[model samples]
Structure formats: structure tokens, C-alpha cells
Target: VRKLATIRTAGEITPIAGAEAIECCHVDGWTCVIKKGEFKQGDRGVYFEIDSFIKEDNDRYPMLSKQVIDYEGQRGTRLRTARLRGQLSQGLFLPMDRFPELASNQVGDDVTEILGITKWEPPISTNLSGEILGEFPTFISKTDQEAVQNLIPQIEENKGQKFEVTVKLDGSSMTVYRKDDHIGVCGRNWELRETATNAQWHAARRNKMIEGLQFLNRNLALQGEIIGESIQGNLEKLKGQDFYLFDIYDIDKAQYLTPIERQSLVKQLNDNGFTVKHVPILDDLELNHTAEQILAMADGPSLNKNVKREGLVFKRLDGKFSFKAISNAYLEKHKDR
Candidate 1:
């Protein structure tokens, strides 16, 4: 369940926060506010409410770049399914009234007469006001776009680090998990309520993801996007498509394959009758320089051949799990409208 709303910044004035805030914040010139929850609901502090503006732009709105929805999660997995099946519009929750097709699925109660948009009380576990609520370790963090920008030069300075760069697509995240012969599929945060019709389910079924996991002799989870016109409805691009694996999590090993190692594994899987996304390997520059170059290439028209370009993913060449960065280019490109 994804709720889109407007949120107020912590201070009287501040530069916009990253994607999370941009998705929900009220847009009034240079400032935005949290419109949902208690204060507006006669309660104390801030609470989340659906943003009429953000909701209106569901089909055309630009989202934050660099941030890859983890396929292993609910949202990412759902988005992947939507993309593969060419059901982009179905994957996204749209504003009430604006998109009649989605009005029936409105998440909250019909309190439009008194409160404007529909309103629903927060769940008991997370009864509060503010942009961020609840206690969950899986949610993506809000990092300042400036922080990403400032770190670029430092990364470039250490251009000796080996890394692999992959084309970032403007699609939702997805994760395929097969453990102990049991298959679990989810989106970014929520475990999917409807799995039978999920695109991720289809992709997994087609690729025999469960069997592949067994063959790997490990509880392996692959993270990537289900892209192209087949899945993403309003967000659709070219033709039918598939997913691109970026991270390979080995649950038993308690580690992930390094970027190069993952790439090789993907290749090996492809050779063994499995399909994976195309990942270009880079070695001439360090991770930082490669990050910049990848960002630049991501901006190029070539990367957007089928779908609108989103951003880039970076990994250590040796297949080690390390901190990854998304460029400011992505932030600027997907700025909050």
C-alpha cells in the first residue's frame, strides 16, 4: 500500500528533501507542507494525507532518480510485475476523481466533503503525523541531493577503484525470493496481496526462478526492474520486456556477490538457459569516475532507447557489497513538480 501526500518541511525554510518528501510534500512555489494526519485531522503533530497535486500527476509526474526500488520488497516487486505485463497504470495508485479508472481503488474513506480528499486514520501501530512514520528497517532513507553532488568529486578523485556500471531504467523495482523451495514475492514494502496476477510472478515462473535458486544451492534473491511496455501501463515505453538483475543476495552466505561476480553469475545463468539484463562492464576508471561517466551516459539518448532513462547502478568489480551512490543528475531530472 503506497500513500501519496503532501508534507511540511522540518524548518521554516529549507531546500527540498529527496524523493520521499517530493512525492508527498505540498507544492507552493519553493515550499511544501505535510497536509495529511492529526493537525489537519484535529490531532497533534503531522500526519500523512493524500496530496491532490501529486495524485493528479500519477501518469505524467516525474519521480526521483537514482533511487532503485528494491525488487526484494513489495513495491519493487509489484512494479516489476506491472512492467513485464505492460500494466503500468495498474501498478501505480492514482489520485481520486482524476483517474476514474483508479477511483474505485481509493485507499482511504470518502471524507471528501469535509476534508477535501479521502482520509483514513493511521494504523494503530503507526499512529502519528509527519512525512515519515512507523518503525521499519526496510524503508529507503532520505539523503540530501546535495550530499550526492558533493560526493561526486571525492569519488572521482579515487578513480582507481574497479566497478561495473549498468543502464538505469525508469521502471519500478522488483525482488524474486526463493527459500527452502518456497517462493515469496513482494513490492517495495508490502507483501503482495495479489500474487497470481503479478508480473513478477509471471517472470519468475517463466524463468523458473525457484528452480534456479535450488540449483544455486543457496537462498538467492535477485533485485532488478520489470521494464518495457508490457508491465508499466501509463508508464509504458517500447515493447514487452524483462528484468535486469543488479544484486544477487546469498542468504546462507550472508553476503552478496560483488558487481563483477554478479555479472558473471548472470552470464552463467544466461548460458544455462536463463535470461538476464544486459550489464556493461567497465575497468578503465575508478568507481567514482565510472559513477560520473555512467551518470553522463544515462543522460544520453541511447540509454532511453525504449523507456525514459531513470539513473545508473554501481557495484564493486570484485563483487563486494559496499556503499553505492546515485548522481545529482538523477535528483535534478526527477525533481518534484
Candidate 2:
């Protein structure tokens, strides 16, 4: 699950270029806003990522209290990506002095409700939310990736290795799989019923997709993002529906195929006339990038080039760990839009 808020260490305090009154504290891959000279270097403190909602009733966060939301019955202020004095700052960092109770709670532990913080959830469109299904398929796995900010330790340990980067699509996760001659569709959290008005199931039929990949009969499950008109705020405003293949899981093996293997599988399926669509692979490189450089690459135009793209996903070639660095530009571009 996304660790929207957590107890973390405060890194080196680097003074903001133009704003001498405020400085930035770097941790993992996120730069947080802090008062100048208030926190010394190598201090251990609590940090809240962007999208974390703090309490409006609490004066500790006056910088954002004006932007409060009654989220899930709790009134709170929201932290958003900001460019302070031309420096990119994404979250708030606090010394343990004010939060003495949370100070010793252990680094990386969640402090959401404890600190009266909440996760920010953008409104979902009715059409995209779709009808409820019992539960996501228990037989398959959810495509959850840790944010690059949360996996700095891992990245440092694996520096100078191989990583394959791909564009991250903004859409609802959908899976089309078969088990013993029965075909099914699913959302990220539920086993959507077939022959229903659910968009996931409807997308499968409207695209004539099931038949194209009849090879999934018993051994494979295809997972991808379901995106297009009426889905997830219809960012693209696509005419119909589409699926961008991201992973092909082997049920019998219970493992995801490697990018090399996935490329081969895509070729086989397309050669057999499936024509599966997928975001283009950006590149595969030795993991030698600094934290800032890698995060910077996450931004840029989407595959269409006419609109903003979600971000980028970096998967270790050997599949040890996968993480994402979403485009701050993309987030700002779609703010309340």
C-alpha cells in the first residue's frame, strides 16, 4: 500500500537558492520545505509526502491550512508539489521536537491518523469507478510498485546495475485472464462480473480482445491499464476503450515474465494477430543515475505528445524491485482539472 505519511529522517539542509528564509531538506528522493537553519544536517525527523492531508485545526501547518478538505469526514490541509523560489519542493519535514510522541515511533512507520493526517484521494468519475465486483481475483496479484522516494536504500544498494524504464500510463488497472476454459475480467480490487455494464468487461468485448489472445486459455493471464473515454476523468478523451499491455503473468509458473520475455511474447501474440498496444519502452540502462537525475527523467510528454504523460516506471532487469517516479509537472498540470 502507498505509505502516504510516515516517520522519517531529515536529511541535509540545503538552502533554497532564491528564498534564504526557507531551505529544503532532502530525504530518499523527495525534497521537503523547512525553515532556514532550523534543522541541522543529519537530523532524524518526520516527513509527509505530497498528497498527505494534515489537519486544518492544527496550526503546525499554517502554510497549507487554507487548502483544507473535508476528506472522509476529517477536515485537513493538503500538501501539494510546490516550486519555492525556483526550487522544487514536494513535502513538509518536521523535527521530532514538536512531535515528541511520534519521534520514537521508529523511522518509516506510518503516522497518518496518529498525526491527524489523511491520504488525499482525488474524486473519481462515476463512469470510471464502475459497478462493484465481489473482490479482485484472489488468484492473481495486484500491480503495486513502491515509490522511488521510499526505495532509496534499495536503489543505492543496486547502483550500476541494469534497469528497464517504461512510460507509466494513467488509467485503471484491468486484467483479462482465463481459468480452465472460463474467461473473466477484473478491476484492481474486484472480480468484475462478466455480461455486466462494468467498463472492464465491456472493454474486453468492444475491442474483440479475448478472441485475439485465446492463448490465455489455461496458462497465462494478461494485465494492463484500461483507459479511454469515460475512464479516470477521460484524460485522453479517447474515442472508445483500449488496453496497454504491461505484464504477462504465467499462471502455472506464478511469475511475471521478464521484459525480454515479454517482448518475445508480444511479438508472438502480434504475429498471431493480437496487435496488443503498450507504452513504448524508454530505455534500459545501468543503474548509475543520481536520485535527482532519475526523478527528473520521470517527467515529459506522454506517448501521444499532445498531452501530459503520467510518469515513468523503472523495473530492474532481473525483476528484483520496481518503482515509479511520477512527473511533478504532470500532477501540477492536472490539478483540480
Candidate 3:
């Protein structure tokens, strides 16, 4: 699970050129702006990541009133990236003393729930509306990926491993799974009762996923991105919707399939008359890139079209490690969306 808000140790503090009252510091791969003398190196502070939302009813952060946004019918302030004194600040940081209630908490303890901080969710499109079935299946893993910034230590630790790199398409995440008599489609957080117009259900039907899973006769889950009309403003500029499978998980094993394993399954399904499209694979090579180099590589055009792609996902060929590097260029362009 994502620790949107937590108590973390502050890294080295440095002054921004020509800035006097406000300086910058690092907290777990995130650089944030703070008052000049608010914190010293090694000090513990509560950190809220970008995309974390603070409800307006919460009185702890009255200063965030100007950043309030209306999202999913709720009024709240969403932490976001900004530039102060020409320095890029990625999240919000507050001195630990500000939350005296959390004085006993150790560094790295999650305080999101206690602080009423939630992940900022975009408004759902009408095309994805359907009868709510239940929460996402526990047997299946959600498509949650850690950001490249947060995985710097891991990246440095596994310097020479082989990895499979794929483009991170700008679209809604969807999962289709089959276990025995149960067949279901789910968005990021909830499973939906099948409906004719629901884009997730439509992808499942159009891809012949039911028949494909039955052909294999094994409990499996296929996760992918649903692109086209009404999705992320149709970034690909396609005529209609389409699904691009990125992962295949064996429910019984409770583990994700390797890159080669996933590719073989796709071929088997297609050969048996099931149309399955996998995400565009950019490369299969040894991992020798640093965090900065990988972030630079993430800034590129989409494979489907000449447009600013969201970013890229890198996974070990064995499916043992993975993380996503989002393009700063893309984030700048779609800051509000």
C-alpha cells in the first residue's frame, strides 16, 4: 500500500540561489520547500506526497486553503509539484512538532489515516460507470507501482540485473480475471457488475478474455490499460477504445508471470482465436542506468503516436522487481488532469 503521509527524517538542507526566507530539503527522494530554519538535517517531519489530499474540514493545514481543489465532489487541497526560487518542489513537508499528537510515532510510521489524508482521485468518466459489485478481488494484486524517485535505493542495489522496459500508457487501469465459475472486471479499486456500456467490461468482451481463460483452464488475471475515447482525454487520439495487456498473474500461485511467460500466454490466447494486445515493449536489456538517466529516458513520445507519453515502467525479467518513472514533461502538461 502507498504511504501517502508518513513521518520521515529530513535529509540535507540547502539554500536555493537568491532565496532567503524559504529553502529546500530532501525527504525520501522528494524535494520540498520549507521555511529557512524550520528543520535541520536528520530532523523528523511529517511528509505528504504529491497527489495526497487534505480535506478542508481538517484544521491542521489552514495555509493550504489557497490550494483547495474540487475533486470527486469533495473540497480539499491536493499536494502537487511547484517551483520556488527556480527550484522544483515535489511534495509538502511539515515540522514534526506541528502534530504533537504524533510525537510518540517513530520515523517512517504511516499517519495518513490519522491525518485524514487520502489519495487524490480524478473524476470518473461516465463511460466507466456501472453497478458496483464489491471491492477489488483479494486474490489478485492491484496494479500499484512505486515511483522511480522512491526506488533509488533498489535501483542502486540491483545494478546489473536484466529488465523489461515498457511504455507507461496514459489511460485508466483495468483488470479482468477468471477463477472457476467467477468472472469479473475491475477498475483500480472496485469491481463492477458487467454492463454493456462499461468500458472495462467492453474490453473484456472485445478481447475474448473469458474464452481465453477457459481455454487455459487456470485461474488467471489479466491487467492492462484501457485507452481511447473519454479516457485521459483520448491521449492517443484513437477512434474508439482499446485494451493493452501489461501483466498476467496466476491466481493460484499468487505471483505475477515473468515477461517471457506473459508473452507466451499472449501468443497462446491469440493463436486460439483470442485477440490480446500487450503493451509496447521498448527493450529487453541489462540494467545499468542510474535514477537520473532513467528519468531522462522516460521523457519521450508515445509509441502509438507522436505525443508526450506518461512515462515508462521497468521490471526485472524475472518479475521480482519493478517501478515506474514518470515523465516530468508529461506531468507539467497534465498538471491538473
Report every candidate's CA lDDT.
0.41, 0.75, 0.85
Task: Flag regions of model 2 displaced more than 4 Å.
Answer: 17-20, 59-63, 113-116, 212-214, 233-237
Candidate 3, which segments miss by more than 4 Å at Cα?
57-59, 70-75
lDDT of each residue in 231-307, candidate 3, tens digit only = 87888898888889999989999999999999999999999999888888886758777777788888887856588
lDDT-wise, the better of 1 and 2 is 2
Selected candidate, larger lDDT, 1 vs 3: 3
Displacement of residue 234 (Cα, Å) in model 1 is: 7.1
User: Cα deviation of 60 in candidate 3 (Å)?
Assistant: 3.2
Q: Write the per-residue lDDT of candidate 2 for residues 104-137, one digit (tens) a residue.
A: 5887788777876666767764555676666766
Output the better candidate (1/3) by TM-score: 3
Question: CA RMSD for every model?
Answer: 14.9, 2.6, 1.9
Task: Give the best candidate by TM-score.
Answer: 3
| Backbone clash numbers for all candidates listed | 48, 4, 0
Over all chains combined, what TM-score does candidate 1 have?
0.49
